[PDB]
Amino acid sequence: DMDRFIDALMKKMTVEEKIGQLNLPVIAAKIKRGEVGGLFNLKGVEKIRDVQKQAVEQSRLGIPLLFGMDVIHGYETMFPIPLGLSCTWDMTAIEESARIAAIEASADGISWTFSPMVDISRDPRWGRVSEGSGEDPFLGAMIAEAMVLGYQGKDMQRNDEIMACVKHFALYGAGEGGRDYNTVDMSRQRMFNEYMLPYEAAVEAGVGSVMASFNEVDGVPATANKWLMTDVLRGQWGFNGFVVTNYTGISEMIDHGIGDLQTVSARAINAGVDMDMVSEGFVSTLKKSIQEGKVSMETLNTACRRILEAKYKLGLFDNPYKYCDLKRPARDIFTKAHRDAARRIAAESFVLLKNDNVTLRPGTPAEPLLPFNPKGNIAVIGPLADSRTNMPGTWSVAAVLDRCPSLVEGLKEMTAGKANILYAKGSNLISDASYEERATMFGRSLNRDNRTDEQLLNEALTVANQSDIIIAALGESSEMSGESSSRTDLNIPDVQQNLLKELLKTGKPVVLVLFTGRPLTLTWEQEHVPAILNVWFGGSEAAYAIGDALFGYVNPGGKLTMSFPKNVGQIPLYYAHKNTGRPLAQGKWFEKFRSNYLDVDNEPLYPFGYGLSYTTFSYGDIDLSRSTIDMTGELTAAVMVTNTGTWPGSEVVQLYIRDLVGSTTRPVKELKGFQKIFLEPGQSEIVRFKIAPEMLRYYNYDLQLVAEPGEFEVMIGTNSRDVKSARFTLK
Amino acid sequence: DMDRFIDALMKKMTVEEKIGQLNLPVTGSSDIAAKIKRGEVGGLFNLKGVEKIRDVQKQAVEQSRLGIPLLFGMDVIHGYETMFPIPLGLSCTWDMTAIEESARIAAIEASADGISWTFSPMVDISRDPRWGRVSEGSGEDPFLGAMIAEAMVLGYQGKDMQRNDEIMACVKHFALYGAGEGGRDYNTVDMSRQRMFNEYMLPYEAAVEAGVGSVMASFNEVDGVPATANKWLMTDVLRGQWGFNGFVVTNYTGISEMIDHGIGDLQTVSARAINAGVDMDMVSEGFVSTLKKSIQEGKVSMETLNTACRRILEAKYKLGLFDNPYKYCDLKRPARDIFTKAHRDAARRIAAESFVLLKNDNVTLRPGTPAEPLLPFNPKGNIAVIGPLADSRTNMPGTWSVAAVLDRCPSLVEGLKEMTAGKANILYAKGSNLISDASYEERATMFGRSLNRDNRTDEQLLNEALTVANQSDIIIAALGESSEMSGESSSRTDLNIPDVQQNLLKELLKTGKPVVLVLFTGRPLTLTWEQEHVPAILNVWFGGSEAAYAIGDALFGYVNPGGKLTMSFPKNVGQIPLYYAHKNTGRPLAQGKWFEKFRSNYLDVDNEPLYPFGYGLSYTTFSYGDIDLSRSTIDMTGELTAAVMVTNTGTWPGSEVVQLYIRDLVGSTTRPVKELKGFQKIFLEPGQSEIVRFKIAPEMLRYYNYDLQLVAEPGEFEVMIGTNSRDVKSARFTLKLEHHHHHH
Ligand SMILES: OC[C@H]1O[C@@H](O[C@@H]2[C@@H](O)[C@H](O)[C@@H](CO)O[C@H]2O)[C@H](O)[C@@H](O)[C@@H]1O
Ligand SMILES: OC[C@H]1O[C@@H](O[C@@H]2[C@@H](O)[C@H](O)[C@@H](CO)O[C@H]2O)[C@H](O)[C@@H](O)[C@@H]1O
Ligand SMILES: OC[C@H]1O[C@H](O)[C@H](O)[C@@H](O)[C@@H]1O
Ligand SMILES: [Mg+2]
Ligand SMILES: [Mg+2]
């Protein structure tokens, strides 16, 4: 067993060698000296194999390395960005996506992924919303579990199973002004009821590692916050793994303003941080700290032990080359089967935001633009229409970017012999040339040249007037989201929005195919564009999936996991909000002396859980099996859902709960369950949810996790706004 | 003795009479005469007129069983009839003496008219210019906000409220109400205890410390409990930590609003309120309708009721109302104390002192002559005054002027007419409506602030303004908010000058005539376009009843503007919240390096406000020498002096607000990059110099640490002094636990 092995190995180690197990730098000489615990961001089974060989056969103790990478939403086969993927509301698909990525990365030498990112955010200004699963902690927790299980399986024993890392612990999504890395501040009540569940869920699914976040919490950088890293993570949740810092998280504490390198390094290890990504604070200062009594041997041994336990659990003491099969890349990476899975999952992620009836032939009843049969002349216009490198999305560091088909390319393939695909760039990404450059960093250039916006527009209107339909491929470049990609405006960029206006003015039918990493402020578009399909960033096979949606091969079923506000002045806007002492009643905007603004109502443009289909769904009244239950009972909430339209398709039936009265104020609703059903036209299904006191608990004023007696409102519907309702009492 | 008298009085009262002292209906609430007869009423508010107040007091004294006199409340916020600037504007004076004076005058007038209690000062810290109630406070900063709280309470109450022109003040809104989410009024507040004490609480404390007689509970939740039911707030902090000896009143229907908050029925929330330390029920009738049943049922004890009742009675005793219930009911005072020339003269001085000159660039008026700033200018020729704020009397006082005679204030045109008669012709055009949307204009101009928007087209209004402008030598563009675009329940998600006014502005600028933007506002606005295109921008906030004359004083150079901002002006609403006393983060963007990938910064704008905290210009300029510290190392027992030479390097005499900032460089918790720790407002003639000195003592360097202990920690500090929070000179010093006791 493990304990004996690790005792024995640790009894042989110098203080230096124990310290070295905590170092995760950016080298061959470092490894020879036992100064390296793992490496990260190295791609290639050949390279990784040789570096491992150096560790195993050229270091004193032969201790093998962890190899980390950001395998976020795929290795080479790119699934949608996680925010888009969350919109599937399909935990099976989500697990599959993480399984596939793990198969691919492990085939290439990777034993550790810095995934899943589970940070709750209600601030769409923050670029890293693209990497999470929205604003809701329940959905977030379900997804966390599915991702950890996809990567790790049961116990990481297989050679296609890798170690996961829940990030970023904790509260990183609440950075002030939506500005990446900025100050976080909240009450402990808010932490537990509104932000912490996804981290806890990952821990409880047996995630092997946790990454400390960049932000402060209660005035202490997370990386030096013992309350977080010991009392909560270990003390409350029982985490038995190790904590890794984020990139230079230790030395950044110097800038935060809590001390010099040695001081903040000691505080981090004493807080419960075990591995030091890049900063070399542990390597360069811990021995001195140990000599001065600032860090005990016991603390060092604990951190070292954790690191070694992770390597044992990965099977790296049994076989250091477990993940270095030179034969596997050809078999496992970027296969047709994987790419087909990604295409399917991509089409499942898209959210149909709008699809109004339009006068398409004179005299006929108006009908929607989507789906349509690929015939005639299909214009595909905009700066996202013919970009390969912008399809996979941010955080695709192992992808071959210029290998993904552009939207034009993919649609051309899919329509060969049936229709003509007419392309026009239409506009730049944005008017400001310097913004376009930083927005298209990391190889996402759109090849901006000297053609002016006016020239670009004029070409596009020429093409548009030769067309039977216009697909406007607009929105963000993929690096307008991700890290250090915060925005103060959330519009479709200026020149693109002008292009869209002008395309609408041709009189031809226009479908907005919207690429984004975040919620955008779309009131103008919701008013004037007949059809809007949010395609997020669908992955390496996005172009094909977009075709599947457009041509009706897939009926869109995605639902939003994050509120789309009307303007930036409404931030933060989220569905699970408190009622206030002065709630504005429905339809009463504007009312003086209620909680409301002078210039806009309180509502998002599109609420949490919103998503349309090519069919329609109708809900009966909710049947509750009990009107009362006690603290040990249960009941069933049933509703019949009928496909009332003409298309087969899926519906995410959503369960919300309102605790009507509380000893503290309680949100107007909370997501507490969901089921994704598929129905043929005319077919019905009775959807049943179990409700029990376990589900009705929350963290009260004293942070006690408790369900209080009183009345509850159970709400079931097609989104967080449009619901059927009923009540019961807890005794 | 007060204790004897109140014991004796409380020994006579029934449970219904004790409960009745806790009840505060609104009049000016049903069946008030009969409720007073029954002893069911402890106070009233919103009744104006010393005649009416005396009648009702006589009812209480002569026709209730026990004759217990009433408190009479009103929102005396920035004046009774003589209106001073709105408090946010007033705060830009950086002048505590003037602030105290404004409060003294308002107390003199209010008390003349029967009023014994003002629901002032509002001291809520806010970093969010969306929130309309920023107009009512004194900006983002706790140091300045604390000093203002003190000055206001002292102004209203004096030493001990003994005089018949001193009234009881009420610090509001306890607590954290300025952090409402989305800047939407009444919305959820949430923050750490550390943030509360370091960043929000001090001005409430400074009001308690100044002897404020009462505190008003806020509308917001704190830690998921409505403030009105938050025992931690109303007992543990207010009494347990600060030793507040007064009483707590709810805000309007605060108790019954807890039903909507979602913590129970009227009886439950009323019981929880009184048990929390709330002493008086504004309007809800929660206390009067449910407290006896609660006492029967054991939900509230007789000791809790007695404690609340006693606080109300002690307030009345401390105000001198048992001694003379008609102390403030002198029917002859109104004719000699209210809206007097002496009061109005002070209001005009204080108003001119509140204005903030945001921009005043050189303009070439005529070829061959060197360019000069538009401000100030001698009144000559043809002066156009154009805009929806140009000829509105009723919008001059500002929001929260509930006792003012709105349509007696001169409009800006009228004011400029009087001041320039015989010297210049004032030409006038409306130019635009307040905003394109009529329904918005309506809600924006409620409470008697109509601009009398008519059925003219935007074209009619604009063309009339252009005919004026093209005949004029200078254009005074009177634009911005109506007064009721700020105040309570006036939150905005856009902070621009409204659409049709900004179009008007553009068109006036296109004439080529020189334009001065005289900006009326209750809040920070997003003014990047205006800062780029308008030569001169004078922020006049809302100046009060004498605003028009004060504006003339500034434009013509009778007063040199010396206001400084107390709240950050963002470049856009997507930067909110933006405040000077922020943390460094782990990845600070170095100055001048926007944009840099992997630093804390946005893709589309830099991190900076358009105008920072403490920003403001003058008709002259001031230069700062380097800082001289009297010593470089002290210990906890010591002190040092920071000194800077400030010189008037321009051609005009003028006042400068010299501002002291301190940065605690390293902490056990992260510390802000600076915090205001002092200021001095100096007046300098052209060429003149003055050495400004600040005492720095370890007690000023204290903050609430992780464990909420108010401590100073040894380490390095940076002393910064300058003309605003951005443009500062620097010097460093070290604090130790133990240093030299003598020179050796
Ligand atoms: O005048 C007492 C307090 O009144 C509050 O303003 C109320 C408002 O909350 C209520 O909706 C309307 C209903 O007509 O009456 C106003 O007076 C203010 O929040 C307090 O600052 C003020 O002291
Ligand atoms: O790849 C490991 C972790 O890296 C962080 O992103 C860093 C960024 O913080 C740093 O400035 C640049 C330096 O080029 O490298 C990136 O890797 C991410 O925040 C983590 O999520 C990631 O797991
Ligand atoms: O239009 C001129 C004036 O008319 C009325 O006297 C209004 O009360 C006033 O606000 C306005 O300035
Ligand atoms: Mg309940
Ligand atoms: Mg320090």
- Pair B223, A187: CB distance under 8 Å: yes
Question: Rounded to a whole number, what is the distance in Å from the CA of A636 to chain B's nearest CA?
Answer: 26
In whole angstroms, what is the distance from residue B452 CA to residue B470 CA? 26
Q: What topology is assigned to A335-616 in CATH? A: Rossmann fold (3.40.50)
Q: How many CA atoms lie within 13 A of A23 on its CB side?
A: 21
The residue in chain B having the minimum alpha-carbon distance to the alpha carbon of residue A433 is B604
| Residue B681 vs residues A55, A552, B170, B625: alpha-carbon distances, Å | 68, 72, 28, 17
Contacts of residue B637, Cβ cutoff 8 Å, sequence gap at least 6: B698
H helices within B47-162, ranges in order? 50-63, 87-91, 96-112, 142-157
Residue B634: which residues within 8 A CB-CB, separation 6 or more? B640, B698, B733, B734, B735, B736, B739
Could you tell me which residues of A are annotated as the binding site for Mg(2+)?
A: 659, 661
As given in the structure block, the two tokens for residue A17 are: 């060698």
Separation in Å, CA B621 to CA A292, B532, B649, B654, B680: 54, 21, 6, 9, 17
What ligand 3 atom has the least distance to the C-alpha of B392?
A: 12
**Containing H/E element for B216?**
strand B214-217
CA dist., res. A509 & res. A531, Å (int): 9
Residue written as tokens 């049994």? A318
- Whether ligand 3 lies within 6 angstroms of the CB of B723 is answered as no
**Closest listed residue to residue B7, CA positions, set B323, B321, B306:** B306
The two tokens of residue A621 are 């009244």
In this structure, which topology does domain B340-621 adopt according to CATH?
Rossmann fold (3.40.50)
| B599, closest residue in chain A (CA to CA) | A484
Residue A398 carries which side chain, given as an amino acid letter?
A
Pairing of strands A112-113, A367-368: unpaired
Closest CA to B103 of B147, B162, B152: B152
Quoted resolution (Å): 2.0
Burial classification of residue A193, based on how many CB atoms lie within 10 Å of its CB (0-12 exposed, 13-18 middle, 19 or more buried): buried
Decide: A559 and A89 in contact? Cβ < 8 Å: yes
Q: Which residues pair with B83 in a beta bridge?
A: B79
For A355, phi then psi, to 5°, come to -160, 70
Residue A695 has phi, psi (to 5 degrees) of -70, -20
Decide if B583 contacts A257 (C-beta within 8 A). yes
Nearest to B223 by CA among B234, B235, B233: B233
Instruction: Inform me whether the C-beta atom of residue B444 falls under 8 Å from chain A C-beta atoms.
Output: yes
Q: Which residues of B touch A593 (CB under 8 A)?
A: 488-489
Q: Which residues contact A216 (CB under 8 A, 6 or more apart)?
A: A183, A184, A185, A222, A256, B583, B585, B670
Nearest Cα residue to A243 out of A272, A270, A281:
A272
Give strand pairing partners of B428: B385
CB A681 within 8 A of CB A646: yes
For residue B662, give the H/E element and its range: strand B654-664
Q: Annotated binding residue at B666?
A: yes
User: Helix axis angle, A297-313 relative to A281-291, nearest 10°?
Assistant: 140
CA distances from B304 to A44, B16, B276, B298 (A): 74, 14, 10, 11
Q: What is the best residue among B386, B393, B484 to mutate for testing ligand 3's pocket, by most ligand atoms within 8 Å of CB? A: B393
Chain A residues 137-176 within an 8 A CB cutoff of chain B: 176
B528 at the A interface (CB within 8 A)?
no
Query: Is the Cβ–Cβ distance between B484 and B378 less than 8 Å?
Result: no
Closest CA to B201 of B178, B181, B230: B178
Q: How was this structure determined?
A: X-ray
Question: Is A495 touching B (CB cutoff 8 A)?
Answer: no
Cis amide leading into A170 (omega within 30): yes
Distance CA A223, CA A202 (A): 19
Strand partners, A210: A166, A243
CATH 2.60.120.10 corresponds to the domain B622-744: no
Task: For B425, list phi and psi in degrees, rounded to 5.
Answer: -105, 130
User: Regarding the domain with residue range A617-731, which homologous superfamily does it belong to in the CATH classification?
Assistant: Immunoglobulins (2.60.40.10)
Q: How far apart are CA A218 and CA A225, in angstroms?
A: 9
Give which of B604, B606, B607, B674 to mutate to test A binding, by max A Cβ within 10 Å: B604
User: Does residue B702 belong to the interface with chain A, where contact is any CB pair within 8 Å?
Assistant: no
Q: Establish whether residue B483 lines the binding site of ligand 3, counting it when its CB lies within 6 angstroms of any ligand atom.
A: no
User: Taking CB atoms and an 8 Å cutoff, what residues of chain B touch A595?
Assistant: 184-187
CB-CB contact of B549 with B543 (8 Å): no
CATH 3.40.50.11540 at B1-339, yes or no: no
User: Among partner residues B187, B492, B607, which is closest to A598 by beta-carbon distance?
Assistant: B492
Q: Is A581 on the interface with B (CB under 8 A)?
A: yes
Is the Cβ–Cβ distance between B142 and B202 less than 8 Å?
A: yes
Q: After which residues is chain B broken (C to N over 2.5 A)?
A: 28
> What spacing in Å lies between the alpha carbon of B79 and ligand 3's midpoint?
21
Under DSSP, is residue A538 helix (H, G, I), strand (E, B) or coil? Answer: coil
Q: Which residues of chain A are within 8 Å of residue B605 when distances are taken between CB atoms? A: 488
According to DSSP, residue B408 is labeled G
Q: Tell me the C-alpha distance between A224 and A211, whole Å.
A: 12
Three-class SS of A647-672: CCEEEEEEEEEEECCCCCCCECCEEE
Structure tokens at B577: 């919240």
Contact between residue B587 and residue B600 where contact means Cβ atoms under 8 Å apart: yes
Task: Tell me if B219 and A582 make a contact (CB, 8 A cut-off).
Answer: yes
Q: Would you say the C-alpha torsion B713, B715, B719, B724 has a positive or negative sign?
A: negative
Residue among B515, B525, B391 at smallest CA distance from B461: B391
Mutate to test the pocket of ligand 2, among A246, A250, A275, A484 (most ligand atoms within 8 A of CB): A246
Distance CA A452, CA B507 (A): 28
User: B728-736 and B633-635 as β-strands: parallel, antiparallel, unpaired?
Assistant: parallel
| Cα angle for residues A664, A670, A675 (degrees, 5° grid) | 155
Q: What CATH superfamily classification does A1-334 receive?
A: Glycoside hydrolase, family 3, N-terminal domain (3.20.20.300)
Q: A590 touching B, CB under 8 A?
A: yes
Do the bridges between strand A635-643 and strand A684-691 make them parallel or antiparallel, or are there none, so unpaired? antiparallel
B91 lines ligand 3 (CB under 6 A): no
Q: Cα torsion for B339, B340, B345, B351, to the nearest 10°? A: -10
Question: Can you say whether the dihedral through the CA atoms of A611, A612, A613, A616 is positive or negative?
Answer: positive
Cis amide prior to A168 (ω within 30 degrees)? yes
Residue B49 near residue B113 (C-beta atoms within 8 A): yes
Nearest CA to ligand 2 atom 14: B598
Tokens of A199: 């981290």
CA distance B331 to A573: 53
In the block, residue with structure tokens 């003219």? B456
Crossing angle of helices A261-271/A281-291, nearest 10°? 90
Q: Which of A193, A247, A264, A599 to mutate to test the interface with B (most CBs of B within 10 A)?
A: A599
**Structure tokens given for A324:** 């270095």
CB atoms within 10 A of CB A591: 13
Alpha helical stretches, state H, A314-417:
328-332, 336-349, 407-415
Residue B537 bridge partners (DSSP) = B359, B517
Interface with B, mutate which of A122, A135, A187, A584 (most B CBs under 10 A) = A187
Kindly provide the b/e burial profile for residues A656-677, where b requires at least 16 CB atoms within 10 angstroms of the residue's own CB: bbbbebbbbbbbbbbbbbbbbb
| All structural domains of chain A with their residue ranges | 1-334, 335-616, 617-731
Atom of ligand 2 nearest to the CA of B598: 11
